[PDB]
Amino acid sequence: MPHAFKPGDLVFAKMKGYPHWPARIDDIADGAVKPPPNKYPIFFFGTHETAFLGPKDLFPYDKSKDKYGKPNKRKGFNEGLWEIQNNPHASYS
Ligand SMILES: CC(=O)N1CCCNCC1
Question: Is 40 a pocket residue for ligand 1 (Cβ < 6 Å)?
């Protein structure tokens, strides 16, 4: 059975206006800004942007990749697909 989301989990993450996007649940570094309650820090592959999202917008990557893991015209998306498949736990700072 599923657990709660934890840092390192791979997802597609959904935001208004954008296709389901390859992403991971990030850690919060010591001294860094914490997310709001019930929100996770989401790191978007390809764009390397961070947003705070709740589980309603988080789709586990293995279950969803057949649906969501296809190339897209949007800036950063295809680089994002490479990252999530090839080095999803790397430093992208
Ligand atoms: C984090 C964010 O605002 N976005 C929009 C730009 C593309 N990355 C997907 C989600």
Answer: no
How many domains, the chain?
A: 1
CA 92/CA 63 separation, integer angstroms: 25
Decide if 61 is inside a domain: yes
Query: Residue with structure tokens 């997802």?
Result: 11
Residue 83 near residue 23 (C-beta atoms within 8 A): no
Q: Which helix (H) or strand (E) holds 43?
A: strand 40-44
3-state secondary structure of 44: strand
- The structure's method of determination equals X-ray
Q: Which atom of ligand 1 is nearest to the CA of 46?
A: 8
Torsion of CA 89, 57, 36, 87, to 10 degrees: 10
Evaluate whether residue 4 is within a structural domain.
no
